[PDB]
């Protein structure tokens, strides 16, 4: 599913991401834009041989099982394929664990390099939330 901007903003809010670990909804929408372009089916191979899955490009090195990431963990206890669903419940549940792990949203290098410190409110502009 390719979410619309406000569509994804509504879904993330409904799933309790708005101000989760102090991150406003626009931070999460911004992260999703630069990680996946709001595409639930996005997959990207990392140089270390792990893969990033779904709207928030959750990494098989630590968070989900894809059966092809040696010495990896599955801390969200989910198949990485579950992170490609049109229903973002699994991605959001797993992202709550990631953002809680100590470095907040710096876990998402695209967030740190493209969203952090910017006018992230712009990403929920015009949305009926
Ligand atoms: Na894994």
| HSE (side-chain half, CA atoms, 13 Å) at 14 | 10
Residue 7 φ then ψ, to 5°: -60, -50
For residue 32, what is the DSSP state?
Answer: H
Lookup: tokens for 113: 């390099």
* Distance in angstroms (rounded) separating the CA atoms of residues 119 and 105: 16
| Residue 82 · residue 90 · CB < 8 Å | yes
Q: How far apart are the first and last CA of the chain?
A: 20
Catalytic annotation, pick one of 48, 52, 87, 119: 52
| Residue 69 · residue 81 · CB < 8 Å | no
Resolution of the experimental model, in Å, one decimal = 1.6
Instruction: Tell me how far apart the 2 most distant CA atoms of the chain are, in Å.
Output: 45
| Residue 58 · residue 67 · CB < 8 Å | no
> What topology does CATH give the domain 1-129?
Lysozyme (1.10.530)
- Ligand 1 centre to CA of 100 (Å) is 18
Query: Tokens 């579950």 map to which residue?
Result: 82
- Ligand 1 centre to CA of 105 (Å) is 20
| 52 catalytic residue (yes or no) | yes
Q: Where are the beta strands (DSSP E) in the chain?
A: 43-45, 51-53, 58-59
| HSE (side-chain half, CA atoms, 13 Å) at 111 | 21
CA 111 vs. chain centroid, Å, equals 10
| Residue 84 · residue 57 · CB < 8 Å | no
Domain boundary assignment for the chain = 1-129
87 annotated to a ligand binding site: no
* Distance in angstroms (rounded) separating the CA atoms of residues 95 and 90: 8
């Amino acid at each position: 599913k390719v979410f619309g901007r406000c569509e994804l903003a509504a879904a993330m809010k409904r799933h309790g991401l708005d101000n989760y670990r102090g991150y406003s909804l626009g931070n999460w929408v911004c992260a999703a834009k630069f990680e996946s372009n709001f595409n639930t089916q996005a997959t990207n191979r990392n140089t270390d041989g792990s893969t990033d899955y779904g709207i928030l490009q959750i990494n098989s090195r630590w968070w989900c099982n894809d059966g092809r990431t040696p010495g990896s963990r599955n801390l969200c206890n989910i198949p990485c394929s579950a992170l490609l669903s049109s229903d973002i419940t699994a991605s959001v549940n797993c992202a709550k664990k990631i953002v809680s792990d100590g470095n907040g949203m710096n876990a998402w290098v695209a967030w740190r390099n493209r969203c952090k410190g910017t006018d992230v409110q712009a990403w929920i502009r015009g949305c009926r939330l």
